[PDB]
Write an enzyme that holds these catalytic residues in place. Structure first.
Site, PDB file in Angstrom:
ATOM      1  N   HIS A 155       0.791  -1.211   0.000  1.00 19.33           N
ATOM      2  CA  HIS A 155       0.000   0.000   0.000  1.00 19.33           C
ATOM      3  C   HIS A 155       0.827   1.265   0.000  1.00 19.33           C
ATOM      4  O   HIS A 155       0.651   2.147  -0.834  1.00 19.33           O
ATOM      5  CB  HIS A 155      -0.859  -0.032   1.287  1.00 19.33           C
ATOM      6  CG  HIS A 155      -2.066   0.843   1.231  1.00 19.33           C
ATOM      7  ND1 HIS A 155      -3.352   0.338   1.212  1.00 19.33           N
ATOM      8  CD2 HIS A 155      -2.192   2.189   1.221  1.00 19.33           C
ATOM      9  CE1 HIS A 155      -4.215   1.339   1.179  1.00 19.33           C
ATOM     10  NE2 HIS A 155      -3.531   2.475   1.170  1.00 19.33           N
ATOM     11  N   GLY A 186      -6.771  -4.941   0.272  1.00 23.10           N
ATOM     12  CA  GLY A 186      -7.309  -3.971  -0.676  1.00 23.10           C
ATOM     13  C   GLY A 186      -6.244  -3.380  -1.568  1.00 23.10           C
ATOM     14  O   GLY A 186      -6.499  -3.132  -2.737  1.00 23.10           O
ATOM     15  N   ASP A 187      -5.058  -3.155  -1.013  1.00 23.98           N
ATOM     16  CA  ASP A 187      -3.950  -2.632  -1.812  1.00 23.98           C
ATOM     17  C   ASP A 187      -3.609  -3.621  -2.936  1.00 23.98           C
ATOM     18  O   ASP A 187      -3.437  -3.242  -4.083  1.00 23.98           O
ATOM     19  CB  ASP A 187      -2.720  -2.272  -0.973  1.00 23.98           C
ATOM     20  CG  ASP A 187      -2.255  -3.372  -0.070  1.00 23.98           C
ATOM     21  OD1 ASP A 187      -2.941  -4.395   0.135  1.00 23.98           O
ATOM     22  OD2 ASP A 187      -1.183  -3.277   0.514  1.00 23.98           O
ATOM     23  N   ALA A 188      -3.582  -4.896  -2.591  1.00 22.34           N
ATOM     24  CA  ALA A 188      -3.265  -5.946  -3.553  1.00 22.34           C
ATOM     25  C   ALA A 188      -4.275  -5.988  -4.687  1.00 22.34           C
ATOM     26  O   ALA A 188      -3.915  -6.132  -5.864  1.00 22.34           O
ATOM     27  CB  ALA A 188      -3.162  -7.291  -2.846  1.00 22.34           C
ATOM     28  N   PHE A 191      -3.659  -3.004  -6.847  1.00 17.93           N
ATOM     29  CA  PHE A 191      -2.454  -3.270  -7.632  1.00 17.93           C
ATOM     30  C   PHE A 191      -2.797  -4.278  -8.759  1.00 17.93           C
ATOM     31  O   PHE A 191      -2.287  -4.175  -9.880  1.00 17.93           O
ATOM     32  CB  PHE A 191      -1.326  -3.766  -6.733  1.00 17.93           C
ATOM     33  CG  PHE A 191      -0.832  -2.722  -5.773  1.00 17.93           C
ATOM     34  CD1 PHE A 191      -1.115  -1.391  -5.993  1.00 17.93           C
ATOM     35  CD2 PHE A 191      -0.063  -3.054  -4.693  1.00 17.93           C
ATOM     36  CE1 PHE A 191      -0.686  -0.433  -5.159  1.00 17.93           C
ATOM     37  CE2 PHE A 191       0.383  -2.067  -3.838  1.00 17.93           C
ATOM     38  CZ  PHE A 191       0.057  -0.752  -4.077  1.00 17.93           C
TER      39      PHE A 191
END
Ligand SMILES: Cc1cn([C@H]2C[C@H](O)[C@@H](COP(=O)(O)OP(=O)(O)O)O2)c(=O)[nH]c1=O
Ligand SMILES: [Mg+2]
Ligand SMILES: [Mg+2]
Ligand SMILES: [Mn+2]
Length: 240
Positions: A155, A186-188, A191
């Site tokens: 993140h 959520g970052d993944a 991404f």
């Protein structure tokens, strides 16, 4: 401003000041800082309050309250999406209330993108100090260009051109994924979307810091989708 820093905040009164302060003291000063607080407690709000005096800070507080609202969406993704819609920077980067920026972070990342028009997303290495003084140090390297960022890059370790956001929205309907099935990573998931179109370029330098010690909420989220799922879909996608 050249850079829009988007930070999310929820009930981390003991840590948020150091986070904010690490941003406000950056050697690169041409940024706006969105502090998207998700309606935190009194103690948190009061720690954040003095930083609102800095003319670069754009503070927004939600009205969210209770288990239904906190589990309806991945809250930080909703907040991040809100900030994106207000952002004026050419470059976008993310921060949180438990993560610390090293002083030359913005300077080094902005220089990388300014210098290399062909790179659209960049990432740095990140370090985590496990506490109990320090018992363990974990470093997440940034050694290669990668088409498979999910769960390999955090993140808080990335900066990208605003133009990346257009492409992502065109295909998926939004920037970050607000689905609560991706609450833990959520970052993944964001991404994962970016990786449909762009690889992540490395900055072999440690530019962000985390400290860690070595519910009706948990019980009301949907089943959580995981990293493997994302990595395999990207491998099948076969962009690299
Ligand atoms: C639970 C929750 C977190 N957040 C924010 C706080 C953090 O900046 C960010 C990530 O939450 P965090 O609790 O740090 O998750 P992790 O387990 O990955 O460390 O989300 C909200 O904005 N709203 C919420 O309801
Ligand atoms: Mg180049
Ligand atoms: Mg995480
Ligand atoms: Mn965290």
């Amino acid at each position: 401003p050249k850079v829009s820093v988007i930070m999310t905040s929820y009930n981390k009164s003991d840590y948020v000041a150091k986070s904010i302060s690490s941003i406000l003291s950056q050697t690169f000063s041409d940024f706006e800082l969105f502090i998207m607080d998700d309606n935190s407690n009194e103690e948190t709000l009061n720690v954040i309050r003095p930083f609102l005096n800095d003319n670069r800070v754009r503070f927004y507080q939600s009205d969210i309250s209770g288990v239904k609202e906190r589990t309806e969406k991945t809250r930080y993704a909703a907040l991040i999406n809100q900030a994106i819609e207000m952002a004026e920077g050419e470059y976008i980067t993310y921060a949180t209330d438990d993560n610390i920026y090293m002083p030359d972070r913005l300077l080094k990342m902005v220089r990388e993108l300014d210098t290399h028009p062909e790179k659209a997303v960049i990432y740095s290495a990140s370090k985590t100090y496990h506490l109990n003084d320090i018992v363990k140090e974990t470093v997440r390297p940034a050694a290669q260009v990668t088409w498979n960022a999910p769960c390999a890059i955090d993140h808080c370790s990335v900066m990208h051109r605003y133009s990346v956001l257009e492409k992502v929205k065109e295909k998926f309907g939004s920037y970050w994924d607000e689905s609560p099935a991706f609450y833990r990573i959520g970052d993944a998931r964001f991404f994962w979307r970016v990786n449909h179109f762009y690889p992540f370029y490395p900055l072999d330098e440690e530019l962000d810091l985390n400290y860690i010690t070595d519910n009706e909420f948990v019980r009301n989220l949907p089943p959580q989708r995981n990293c493997r799922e994302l990595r395999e879909s990207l491998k099948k996608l076969g962009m690299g």
